[PDB]
Design an enzyme around this catalytic site. Structure first.
Site, PDB file in Angstrom:
ATOM      1  N   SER B  35      21.970 -45.357  -7.761  1.00 37.55           N
ATOM      2  CA  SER B  35      21.229 -44.556  -8.721  1.00 37.55           C
ATOM      3  C   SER B  35      22.036 -44.407 -10.006  1.00 37.55           C
ATOM      4  O   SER B  35      23.195 -44.817 -10.079  1.00 37.55           O
ATOM      5  CB  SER B  35      20.908 -43.179  -8.135  1.00 37.55           C
ATOM      6  OG  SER B  35      22.098 -42.439  -7.899  1.00 37.55           O
ATOM      7  N   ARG B  42      30.841 -45.571 -10.252  1.00 38.29           N
ATOM      8  CA  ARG B  42      31.374 -46.915 -10.069  1.00 38.29           C
ATOM      9  C   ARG B  42      31.935 -47.440 -11.388  1.00 38.29           C
ATOM     10  O   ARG B  42      33.022 -48.022 -11.420  1.00 38.29           O
ATOM     11  CB  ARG B  42      30.296 -47.865  -9.534  1.00 38.29           C
ATOM     12  CG  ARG B  42      29.673 -47.433  -8.206  1.00 38.29           C
ATOM     13  CD  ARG B  42      30.704 -47.302  -7.093  1.00 38.29           C
ATOM     14  NE  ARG B  42      30.067 -47.007  -5.812  1.00 38.29           N
ATOM     15  CZ  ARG B  42      29.798 -45.784  -5.362  1.00 38.29           C
ATOM     16  NH1 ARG B  42      30.113 -44.709  -6.078  1.00 38.29           N
ATOM     17  NH2 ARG B  42      29.210 -45.632  -4.183  1.00 38.29           N
ATOM     18  N   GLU B 188      18.846 -45.504   7.553  1.00 42.11           N
ATOM     19  CA  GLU B 188      20.252 -45.238   7.256  1.00 42.11           C
ATOM     20  C   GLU B 188      20.622 -43.787   7.541  1.00 42.11           C
ATOM     21  O   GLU B 188      20.505 -42.932   6.661  1.00 42.11           O
ATOM     22  CB  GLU B 188      20.582 -45.561   5.789  1.00 42.11           C
ATOM     23  CG  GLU B 188      22.077 -45.406   5.483  1.00 42.11           C
ATOM     24  CD  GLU B 188      22.459 -45.674   4.035  1.00 42.11           C
ATOM     25  OE1 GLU B 188      21.599 -46.087   3.232  1.00 42.11           O
ATOM     26  OE2 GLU B 188      23.648 -45.473   3.706  1.00 42.11           O
ATOM     27  N   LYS B 230      20.899 -49.132   9.456  1.00 40.21           N
ATOM     28  CA  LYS B 230      22.087 -49.155   8.615  1.00 40.21           C
ATOM     29  C   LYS B 230      22.954 -47.958   8.951  1.00 40.21           C
ATOM     30  O   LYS B 230      22.884 -46.928   8.275  1.00 40.21           O
ATOM     31  CB  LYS B 230      21.710 -49.148   7.129  1.00 40.21           C
ATOM     32  CG  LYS B 230      22.888 -49.242   6.180  1.00 40.21           C
ATOM     33  CD  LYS B 230      22.422 -49.265   4.714  1.00 40.21           C
ATOM     34  CE  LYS B 230      23.601 -49.470   3.753  1.00 40.21           C
ATOM     35  NZ  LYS B 230      23.371 -49.081   2.309  1.00 40.21           N
ATOM     36  N   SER B 272      29.410 -49.684   4.419  1.00 39.21           N
ATOM     37  CA  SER B 272      30.866 -49.832   4.394  1.00 39.21           C
ATOM     38  C   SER B 272      31.533 -48.467   4.244  1.00 39.21           C
ATOM     39  O   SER B 272      32.682 -48.291   4.644  1.00 39.21           O
ATOM     40  CB  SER B 272      31.324 -50.790   3.278  1.00 39.21           C
ATOM     41  OG  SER B 272      30.937 -50.355   1.983  1.00 39.21           O
ATOM     42  N   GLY B 273      30.812 -47.511   3.666  1.00 41.59           N
ATOM     43  CA  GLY B 273      31.223 -46.116   3.669  1.00 41.59           C
ATOM     44  C   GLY B 273      32.647 -45.759   3.261  1.00 41.59           C
ATOM     45  O   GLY B 273      33.254 -44.863   3.853  1.00 41.59           O
ATOM     46  N   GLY B 274      33.183 -46.431   2.248  1.00 43.76           N
ATOM     47  CA  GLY B 274      34.502 -46.093   1.743  1.00 43.76           C
ATOM     48  C   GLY B 274      35.618 -47.011   2.210  1.00 43.76           C
ATOM     49  O   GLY B 274      36.707 -47.020   1.632  1.00 43.76           O
TER      50      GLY B 274
END
Lengths: 349, 349, 349, 349
Positions: B35, B42, B188, B230, B272-274
């Site tokens: 978003s 990022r 997810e 997910k 991948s969560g970090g």
């Protein structure tokens, strides 16, 4: 916190190892755990009075069949038989051990109507279950069985929510108690074939029930690695004039299981539920032509392993050999069906 | 009666076919659906102001990478990007189509605190969802994504029952709406790594959540054949000073999935969560060394596919090629991990 | 369809009529249903060996108290006592009938740990319950009792979901079986005082439990008009150095009940749960100063009706009269508390 | 831990105080919150085109009725009207305030079919709800309304489990969001009268629904002291040729509420749901002849307060006075019914 304490790794290992032994490739369960009243009905079919001596003779006939262990991984016993000796004085469990067949024990105390339902049934037996399991383990049992029953009746809304909730609750409690006592629990939520419903109706109900059952198993901290499922196959109702094709039964049965059963479960061992001996073999075989599967699809057959055996015996002692021969024919048939290699005998979303 | 009406076989077929395409062997999902506020973060990492032009430049950089479709089956898009053109005037979806990458669309409207919880979150977005799905399908999307978030905090009893119930309810509603509109839903339920909890704590919570999720999916008549999961991998908490071994993460992750996920589901595409880019590749790879699995274990990576890509780009246009090169390195890495054939780069019950 | 069949109006009438008789204004229940092991503990307090003769002597001492029926509507009995005669040869039930006290029978078979919980308890006794109820009705019983137990331990997440689910399931099954056999079920979900938790913690847990219980009662088609609730009062934990004020206990107890208990239920009959005799009287009294209430708030006291009685008796036969006198003092105290007219003896959201 | 954080006592106080004001003795709610499409239908009945000017004229006609506040405690508004001025330029809310009528606001976004149900409906509107509530509070609203709808169809098993689960989930989420923003939530689970089912069928379904609703409210930490229920009365289906007697409707309605609604709830404000104006008054009156009740039984009537009013108006401006007169007649009728003192106008288990 608030989660389940860790299971004993030693206990868990034993359960998982024995579950996998029971669900061994090319093998399945002989369900010989008929209660006194159920065996009466079986014997009535062939005109034999239900004496302790006749029951001991018949169970001996089954378990002393030379080479049975090639196709039979385990045998479910009624309490009487677990503590019984053959007419020749050999303990029933020793006959099993001699073929390398794992003894199992039925542990439910039968059915009782749920108040204010239309004759829908709860399974009883939790009281004292844990203590019984300990004794049974010591007697040689390494797995247990608990039968719950559900009816399909669209007009009556069966199975009702209460039925499903009760069945699942009882199965989960029973399963967890069993594992606490080192016994692999066979989870049997049998949806009866009674009625004229379609196979797609059976599929829908089977999915709802199993979804409820496995949620409850998870809630009660049941180890799926150390448990087995004994479900109905997905079929037309027994009043439907057209038995579904073996392909159809195989497709919907596998579909229903894959939609609901987590793959940590090592084995699905079908009840035969009134099917002829040959249908039960062909249906299983057709499923295993569709492999490989995330779990073993095999059998836990009572009637579908004994029907011809009883009729060959007729209560006549001298017919023992012939009776044992036919039991082998069917044990071999179903073992081969497990591998999808049975020749036969005498995507929808 | 009282069960779910039959799904359209034509719709079901499409969903199932596209789900399998997304979970193709040796391939996985590029999660580029940040978003406006998430992409800001990022870009902050590399000192780039969040302009529409820069976002268009970056998403073009990703999707126009020659040969990306060899390793990337689908790409999740934010609404802006779905209706966006590259700086050169090529629609983003056309870049995807040119590589044979299936467009997907994020459809949730973000998080909102559940009243009277300790900042536990509900996912919003059901209002108008069905209409949005129709438009998105027409724009080229063939799958969707909806992110729910859960926290672990043993001291605070997180995740609470309300959290789990809400997450599961929202995911099921979203999934069913998606399938009604011919979109494969990615489910997810992300359990955040926040905290100093052990990997075994993560395993227990992941099991509870997924059990709840798949029961809800069943309740809402979601077609598992036409859906994807997910989930978080099962890991130590992000505050734990010792990152678990890749073997450990692989073992507990697979275990948790096999204990809860019915095998009709075609694919599990991990967030991948970090995790670092290399951990995310190694962990997946280690899981697929343990195959074959009842479902595809693959990836739906955002950060773990873009981290080095962003740092190679730095907002500098001339760094486009080098940036695309590194994206390929990682896409290849994770594609190979899917098959358990990644070499590396620069039973507990 | 799919709902509960209609209850027998004749049965329902009987149940509702007897429930209202038990929850009569100015009256409450004498809980004298101590099992063999529980009564041992009570007798240990006063140095009396637990012989059948001593138990018969003591229960006779209670039930033969002249004028007891003025304050005591019903008396809960242990099975032994229901089929027991006083030392003089008068059946215990006949003593009750002579005072117009309704006999009740405890029907659970005690507690068993739920596997893989931290010593959380299931209540056993459903097996054979329906048959026992029939016999008990014939022996003169008109209501039953079933005790479930829950612990508070925030650090351990107690009571866990499994605990609450089990308690509620067992209570609902028991209640429905009872009503099918014309016995009013007392529903006793006792939250133990163990621990140093606050009264507001007790309030929160009590609300969660009762919400779960009454949902389950509804699911199992229990007739609330023909049932009674026996809950803990809402108090500080027994390890808290400061016993809450009687006003505080009254406020939170009433609040918790009004937030969860539908008003078709005729009566709430509190357990005393370790409270002194005087606290139990004062707390009830304080609640009924806050009336009128949607249901009767009364008592089903064991220890809080017998503590001084036992200490006055001391096992000495000649102390019978004095012992009976003190029982009357307390029966009168609690009867008056029911009406909010007890003088004493020797809004938060 | 793991329970709901404590509500703000200041917020809770406000909610509870306003809930009690709305459920004031001798008073009830005017439901004038017809959406643009619903009001079209109402106007179609009397041949009036649905213009903004006509809507403003009509709502002014209602709220400017001198002395209305004697019988009307609150008025539910559609968003348009909340921000609307009368033809003379007086804000609608100021008309309400002048009579001391509390403004309320409908906050759901209408109905959407649940996928794969037989046209069963979910209520939408949670997205942005919390922000809308804040604005509405500032505009003068102090309570909210959210309508869920369920159908009875025994042949189709309606209402299905999914319907009930969805309705309850949506209502609980909405209620908790409302209270977080200082708005009293009206919980409206309307069971439609459609069909030829019996009153006893309606009673059974109403009980099941409300049991589910109040369990969900508890799960979501809704403050019952600061909420209101707007349920259907329990009646025969609208296709049944015999309207049930007022005594019968009163008995089963009260019974259904007392079996499921905890008495901390201050008020039950019935929807009229197609009933004639006089039936709606008589049915309520008959219920309050059965008092005193644990909660206020009153009205939240749309059609049953406006039917004759609209027909007296006919779109003719000069008929304003006569129209206001008839509204008073009915407001008085229902206010008196609240007290069980309405004369009339022109135990089963």
């Amino acid at each position: 916190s608030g989660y389940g304490l860790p299971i004993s790794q030693e206990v868990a290992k034993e359960l998982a190892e024995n579950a996998r032994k029971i669900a061994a490739p090319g093998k399945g369960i002989l369900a010989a755990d008929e209660s006194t009243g159920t065996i009466k009905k079986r014997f009535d079919s062939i005109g034999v009075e239900n004496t302790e001596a006749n029951r001991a003779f018949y169970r001996d006939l089954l378990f002393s069949t030379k080479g049975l262990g090639q196709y039979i991984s385990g045998a479910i016993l009624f309490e009487e038989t677990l503590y019984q000796k053959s007419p020749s004085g050999v303990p029933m469990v020793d006959l099993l051990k001699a073929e390398g067949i794992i003894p199992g024990i039925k542990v439910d105390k039968g059915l009782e109507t749920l108040p204010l339902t239309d004759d829908e049934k709860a399974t009883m037996g939790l009281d004292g279950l844990s203590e019984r399991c300990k004794k049974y383990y010591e007697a040689g049992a390494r797995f247990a069985k608990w039968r719950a029953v559900l009816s399909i009746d669209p007009a009556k809304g069966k199975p009702t929510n209460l039925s499903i909730t009760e069945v699942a609750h009882g199965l989960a409690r029973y399963a967890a108690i069993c594992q606490a006592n080192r016994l692999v629990p066979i989870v049997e939520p049998e949806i009866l074939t009674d009625g004229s419903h379609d196979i797609t109706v059976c599929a829908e109900v089977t999915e709802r029930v199993l979804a409820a059952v496995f949620k409850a198993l998870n809630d009660h901290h049941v180890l799926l690695e150390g448990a087995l499922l004994k479900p109905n196959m997905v079929t037309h109702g027994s009043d439907c004039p057209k038995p579904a094709s073996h392909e159809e039964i195989a497709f919907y049965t596998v579909r229903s299981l894959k939609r609901t059963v987590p793959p940590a479960l090592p084995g699905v061992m079908f009840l035969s539920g009134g099917q002829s001996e040959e249908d039960a073999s062909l249906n299983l075989n057709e499923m295993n032509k569709m492999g490989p599967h995330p779990f073993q699809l095999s059998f836990s057959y009572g009637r579908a392993l004994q029907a011809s055996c009883l009729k060959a015996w007729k209560g006549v002692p001298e017919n023992k050999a012939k009776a044992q021969q036919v039991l082998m024919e069917r044990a071999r048939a179903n073992g081969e069906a497990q591998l999808g290699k049975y020749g036969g005998g005498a995507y929808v979303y």
